[PDB]
Amino acid sequence: SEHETRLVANLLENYNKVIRPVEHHTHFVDITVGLQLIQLISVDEVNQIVETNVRLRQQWIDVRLRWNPADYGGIKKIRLPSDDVWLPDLVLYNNADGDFAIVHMTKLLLDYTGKIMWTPPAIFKSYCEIIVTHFPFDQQNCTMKLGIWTYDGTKVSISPESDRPDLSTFMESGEWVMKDYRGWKHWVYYTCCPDTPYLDITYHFIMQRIPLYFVVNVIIPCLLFSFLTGLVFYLPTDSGEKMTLSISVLLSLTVFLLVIVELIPSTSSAVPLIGKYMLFTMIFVISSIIITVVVINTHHRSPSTHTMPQWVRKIFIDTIPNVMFFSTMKRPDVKSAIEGVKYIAEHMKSDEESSNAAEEWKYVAMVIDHILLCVFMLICIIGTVSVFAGRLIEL
Template identity: 50%
Template structure:
C-alpha cells in the first residue's frame, strides 16, 4: 500500500503499478490512477492536483482508504511549522545558560531580609538621587506638589559578587527587585512606587535600582506677588528603620567634604511644564540627633524653586482688571445729575467683584498675606464707591 498525504482525500493504492487503476471507496470517490514501482516514489494526478506519497506494504484491496495525501503547498506549510516549533523548543532550554546558572548560584541561599554587610557593626552606604520626569500639578489651595520622579539608588551587596570568567563573561544581571535586599528609603509625604522595576547587579557587588514613583510633597505657598510669584517645595527622603550607623545615606553627586549639592535633581528627561519654570534644584544632606536615641538619623532634602509663567494670568486677569479700572475716569466727564453716571459706576463695581471672586478661587485661603492684585482690586472698588 502506498501512503498519500492530502488534507481531504484518502486512497488505497495496490502495488501493481502496471495494472488497471483501482478505486478508493469513501462516500462517492472517483477513480485515481497512479504510476511507479513498489519501492519508489510516485506522483498521482487527479483533477489537476499533485500529490506526494511513499510506498507501504500492500494489504489488499480494502474498500476503506488507508493512504493519506497532502498537496505540495500544504506540505510545505506543515513542514515549516514543524521545523519552527522544533527549533523553538530546542533552543529555548539552552538560551543563556551562563546567566541562569549565575542567577541560581547567587540567589539560591540569599536572604533578602538581612542587611548585606559582613559584620553587624559595618555601615552600608546607600547613594540616592532623583530624576524628575514631570511636574504633574501644584495645588495652591491644598499646598501640595505632585511630581513623577525616578528614585535612583545604589549600594554594594557583598553577597552578590562573582567572577565573570566563571560564568561565560556575564558581568551584569537583571533580577526582580523583590528577590534582593532593598533599602527602606521612604519619603516624608505621599510616596508611591508605580512599578517595581528590576535591579541591575554588577559583578563587583554594586546594585542599581531606579523605580519610578509618584510623589506628593508639601509646599508653603506664598501668594503675595501672585501671579509674579516663586514657590519653593521640598522632597525629603530618609531610611525608616535604619539609623546613620547602619545605613549611611548620601547623594549620588555628593562630595566627601560637603553636604550641599547645587544641582540635586537630574532634569535631563524633564517634560517642560506649561505653568511653571524650574529655577533651582539644590539638595542637602542632614544628620539629626533626637532625644530618644544616641544614633544619628540621616535624610536628604531636595528643594524645587518654581516660578509661575505669567502670560495666561496677564492676558485673562490683569489686563481686563486694569482696563475696567480705567473706565472709572469716565465718571468725571458725566454730569452729576445724569443717570448714566450711577449705572457706569455700578457696572464697574460688578465687573471688579467678579474678578475678585475669581482671584479668591485661585489663591489658597490664607490669612497670612493678601496678594498685591487683591489689594489693587479692593482699592479700585473703594475708589469707585467713593465716586458714586
C-alpha cells in the same frame, strides 16, 4: 541563557532579603541616592501640593550577590527583580497626597562585584508651602525630603550622587521656570537618642511662575474696569446714566473678586497683593459712587429750598475754574388784560431768577466733576504704575 539561569539559581538559593547586605552587623550599608526630575506635573496652589515625575536612583553594594564571571560564560551584568533582593526603605517625609515609599518594583542592575543600581519611577505628591503674596509674579521654593525610615545612620547611610538633582531630561513646564535646584544632606540628632544620628536628604527647586496667562486672563480686564471707574466724572448728570456706569463697574469687579478668591489658597499667613489691590479698587469704586451721588444731589438742588453758601460760591466759581487751563469752561376788561401782561412778565422774571440759581448749582456740580476726574485719573495711573513693585508695567 543557560549560564545566566544557573547564575540566578545560585545567587538566590540561600539569600535572605530580610537581612541587611553587610558582612558584619556593626557595619552600615552605604547607599548613594540620586534624584532625577523628569516632569513637573502640577503645582496645586489651593491645596499646597506639588506633583512631580521623578526617578529615584539608588546604588549600594550587596556582597552576597557577587560571582566570578569566568564560571558563567563571562556574564558581568544581570537584571534582577527588585522584589528578590534587600532594598532600602527610602520614604518621602513630606508626602501629602501620594505614596510614602516606592511602589513600582522595577528590575535592577547587578554587577558581578555586587554593585546594585536601581532607578524606580515615582510620582511624588509633596507638601508645598505656597507663598501667595506676589501672585501671579511669585516664585516658589518647596522641597522633597528623603530618608531611610526604619534604619538610623549607623545601620544605613545615604549620600547624594551630586549637589543638585538631575534635570538633564527635564520636560519644560510652560507654567514654571526652574531657577535653582539643590540637594542638601542633614544630620539630625535627638536628645532621646544621642548615639544614633538620623540622616536625611532634602532636594529643593526654585520655581518662577510665567505670568502671561494670569496677566491676560485676569489682570488686564481688572485694569480695564478700574480705568473705566473714573470715567463717570466726565459723564454729564443730565444724561441720567452715571449710576448705570458706576454700578456696572462695581458688578464686574465683584465677579472678578469671585474669580480671584477661587484662584488662591485661603491661608492668612500672608495677604496676597492681588487681593489687597482688588479691595483697594473696590474702595476706589465705592468712593466714586458716593461722591457721584453727592454730585447728582448737588446738580438737582432746588433753588427754592437751598441757597448757595458764600464759601461754596467763592471756592467753586471764583478761584478753581481759573486754575484749570486745559478745560473749556466759561470763567373795563382792558385793565384785566393789563394785569395779565403784568403777571406774565413777573412770572417770567421769577422763573429767570430761579433758573439762574439752578444753573449756578449745576456749574458747581460740573466743577466738582472736573476736579474729581483729574484726581481720579492721576490716582489710577499712579496706582497702575505702582503694583507688584512695577513688575506689571514692566511686563
